[PDB]
Amino acid sequence: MTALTLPEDIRQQEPSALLYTLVSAYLEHTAQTGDESLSCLSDDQHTLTAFCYLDSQVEEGGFVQLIASGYGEYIFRNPLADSLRRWKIKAVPKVLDKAKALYEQHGKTIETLADGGADIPSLRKQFPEFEEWDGAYYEAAEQDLPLLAEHIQSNWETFAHIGQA
Amino acid sequence: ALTLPEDIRQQEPSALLYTLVSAYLEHTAQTGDESLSCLSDDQHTLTAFCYLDSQVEEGGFVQLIASGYGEYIFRNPLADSLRRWKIKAVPKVLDKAKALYEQHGKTIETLADGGADIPSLRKQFPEFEEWDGAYYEAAEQDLPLLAEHIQSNWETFAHIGQ
Numbered sequence: 001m002t003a004l005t006l007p008e009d010i011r012q013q014e015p016s017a018l019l020y021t022l023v024s025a026y027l028e029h030t031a032q033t034g035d036e037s038l039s040c041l042s043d044d045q046h047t048l049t050a051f052c053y054l055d056s057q058v059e060e061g062g063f064v065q066l067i068a069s070g071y072g073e074y075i076f077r078n079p080l081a082d083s084l085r086r087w088k089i090k091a092v093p094k095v096l097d098k099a100k101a102l103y104e105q106h107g108k109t110i111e112t113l114a115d116g117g118a119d120i121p122s123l124r125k126q127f128p129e130f131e132e133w134d135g136a137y138y139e140a141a142e143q144d145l146p147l148l149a150e151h152i153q154s155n156w157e158t159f160a161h162i163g164q165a
Numbered sequence: 166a167l168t169l170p171e172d173i174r175q176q177e178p179s180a181l182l183y184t185l186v187s188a189y190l191e192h193t194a195q196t197g198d199e200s201l202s203c204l205s206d207d208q209h210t211l212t213a214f215c216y217l218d219s220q221v222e223e224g225g226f227v228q229l230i231a232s233g234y235g236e237y238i239f240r241n242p243l244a245d246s247l248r249r250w251k252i253k254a255v256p257k258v259l260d261k262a263k264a265l266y267e268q269h270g271k272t273i274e275t276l277a278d279g280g281a282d283i284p285s286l287r288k289q290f291p292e293f294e295e296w297d298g299a300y301y302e303a304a305e306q307d308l309p310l311l312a313e314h315i316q317s318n319w320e321t322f323a324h325i326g327q
Binding site: 020024025030034036037067069071074075078111 | 183190191193197200216230232234235236237238240241270274278279
């Protein structure tokens with residue numbers, strides 16, 4: 001009956017779990033409806049979704065995985081960093097601007113090599129310039145995921161439903 | 166893993182593709198598998214073709230680009246995988262559209278980021294109109310070819326891990 005399938009105890013979850021549970025419920029819903037464009041999500045829900053993809057990819061395999069897998073023109077766009085800054089979340093945006101610059105220099109090569117069968121862990125050693133930024137991301141993330149959680153808890157109706165804000 | 170209608174294999178070619186990919190995505194949403202690690206290369210080919218088709222049908226190549234799909238769709242694995250399956254018309258459109266993305270994509274994306282609406286951008290970049298129309302013609306033939314390949318290999322496509 002609701003669009004979103006959320007556990008009873010969702011509001012008690014820690015910041016990373018809360019983000020992933022919400023984004024996962026958004027994506028479950030959009031898969032079920034065929035809404036590939038994510039048209040049912042608000043701008044704020046798109047900010048969460050993008051931050052979650054950022055997080056998952058960098059934690060799994062660095063900015064190099066993010067790039068090689070094809071996320072670069074989704075993540076390295078102003079709406080994500082501008083929306084986080086509006087919520088007074090600044091550290092991850094700073095890291096994104098730094099990483100974007102490296103993406104402009106090396107992204108085409110990373111992607112080309114990936115297309116030809118270079119494995120991502122190997123590419124992460126070939127492009128060690130991103131390591132600094134991977135690490136900066138991990139540092140900025142514990143703080144900024146808690147800020148994000150505070151923002152979500154302050155605006156619960158916006159985030160925990162479709163079509164209410 | 167996958168929730169499919171009982172009569173899935175009686176669907177017409179676009180509905181089949183969309184229903185399969187939706188089931189993949191429902192599964193991965195439920196498990197948190199955002200990297201789509203559970204999908205085979207062949208299921209990744211279906212998923213990418215689906216996203217190509219949805220974005221182009223909704224709003225042209227310009228929408229595909231504006232929304233951020235360019236480094237997912239304009240990559241060799243999609244086109245190469247299709248050509249292994251003897252599906253050639255969509256790959257040819259992809260390669261032509263990729264060259265236009267390399268020319269115009271940065272501008273389309275920047276303008277979108279600044280608030281330009283996607284229908285307006287599609288008028289601002291009419292270079293893509295030829296290729297939107299070439300994709301609609303290529304996909305009419307190639308989505309049937311894809312459906313015949315999926316029906317020839319059903320268990321590959323209708324399950325995880327097989």
